[PDB]
Amino acid sequence: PWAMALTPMEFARKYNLLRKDDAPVPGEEMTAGIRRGDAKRVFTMQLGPYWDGFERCSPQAYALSAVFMARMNRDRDAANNILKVLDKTFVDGKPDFSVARPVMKKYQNSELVQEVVAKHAYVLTVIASLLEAAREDGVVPSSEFLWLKPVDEELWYMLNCVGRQTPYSEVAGPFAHWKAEKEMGRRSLVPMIDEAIRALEIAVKEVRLTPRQMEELEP
Amino acid sequence: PWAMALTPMEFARKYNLLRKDTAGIRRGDAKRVFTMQLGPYWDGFERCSPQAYALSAVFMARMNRDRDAANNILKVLDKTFVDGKPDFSVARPVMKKYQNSELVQEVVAKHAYVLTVIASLLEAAREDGVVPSSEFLWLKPVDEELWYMLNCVGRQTPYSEVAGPFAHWKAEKEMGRRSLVPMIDEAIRALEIAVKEVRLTPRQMEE
């Protein structure tokens, strides 16, 4: 009934990322490896599309981006109006994302928004940075857009990773990318997801397998 | 012995773009040729060509009122072109110092392509006065697209060899944002118009 976040080992099996070994490393006896190539592909697909104007985003990403721009520019009423109109209209059927249009139009070219957009190359890494910035004005909890979880899972988990230390595996690639753009000091179109692969490798090494489980791995 | 910039008709011929309507233009193929002119996306100055890197740094130096750093780059590139191969690395210290300067960050934010970024660097450099091509003549043999693109900045109309990126450059400015989707339709329109103006040489072969 309730969508549960996957653990590292569940994520790895679901995407067929577990590998036998070849070459004997101490402390790591009955343990699986990671298919690096495959893991890269999967984390790269998590990254999603390039930012290329707010109007090419999904309505969700566009609507929520508007809310965070509103907060960045100290306009709580505009932010709150959106969130309220989306709640009203979620009771009966589909959220009315179009209410975000005046706000986006008003703030997308504002100075704080431009600064964020210039730092990030992907829809997900921009909107993540918009949330972070919006939180310098107040709380902006995920509870205010609870409807997003059923709707768009990746966006939900990326937004809930903002301000945490460790990501959900579902969004480990865009999380890794986001912090790499922050460390490099620039937007990066080339994926920078090595951290998500190391974290995965490390978390897999924590799990002893049985003989039968080991037999099941392929090379 | 001298590279002459192609006319819009010679350009059309070189790339098999003339058809029966007045000639007409093959729209699909022209779109493909203007898109190829756009070149690679910007994704850090370290991925640029050596010449694009060095000349971006000169322009960053100037934007940041630093004529002596711009002049040393150009001076070195000149002296090492007497001999043989330019030593483009002389601009590593300037790049490093200026790439995150505020003025450079405003420019880089507005443009998604190497050629549209550098084009706005040159334009910004000119807020500090004259930045003529005369000070990098070595480029014309080395890299004609870059050469012609920097000589079109400030001008009403581009050479056809760089009309894609020039078009995309003005589109980005008009949209107010960088655009990864190419916006080269105006290069197609200008090439259509310039072909129509020339009168057909009757007895032609065409498709």
Residue numbers in the entry:
A (entry chain A): 158 to 180, 185 to 380
B (entry chain B): 158 to 178, 192 to 377
Passage from the reporting paper:
Further binding studies were conducted with several DotM mutants, where Arg residues (single or double) on the protein’s surface were mutated to Glu. Five mutants were produced: R196E/R197E (termed “M1”), R314E/R315E (termed “M2”), R347E/R348E (termed “M3”), R217E (termed “M4”), and R262E (termed “M5”). Binding was abrogated in M1, M2, and M4, indicating that these Arg patches are involved in binding of acidic Glu-rich peptides. M3 and M5 were unaffected suggesting that they are not involved in Glu-rich sequence binding. The Lpg1663 and the consensus OSM peptide was also assessed for binding to the M1 and M2 mutants and binding was found to be also abrogated. To ascertain that the observed binding deficiency in M1, M2, and M4 variant proteins was not due to folding defects caused by the mutations, these three proteins were crystallized and their structures were determined and shown to be virtually identical to the wild-type protein. Thus, the mutations do not introduce structural defects, suggesting that the ITC binding results reflect an effective role of the residues in binding. The final model suggests that CegC3 is primarily helical. Binding is observed between the main middle Glu-rich helical motif of CegC3 (residues E155, E158, and E159; see numbering in Table 2 and interactions in Fig. 5) to the “central patch” residues R314 and R315, as well as between R217 of DotM to peptide residue E162. Two were successfully obtained (M1 and M4) but attempts at introducing M2 failed for reasons that remain unclear but could be due to a destablization of the DotMLN coupling complex resulting in activation of processes that are stressful to the cell. Intriguingly, among the residues we show here to be involved in this recognition process, only R314 is highly conserved, whereas residues R196, R197, and R217, despite their importance in Glu-rich peptide binding, exhibit a lower conservation.
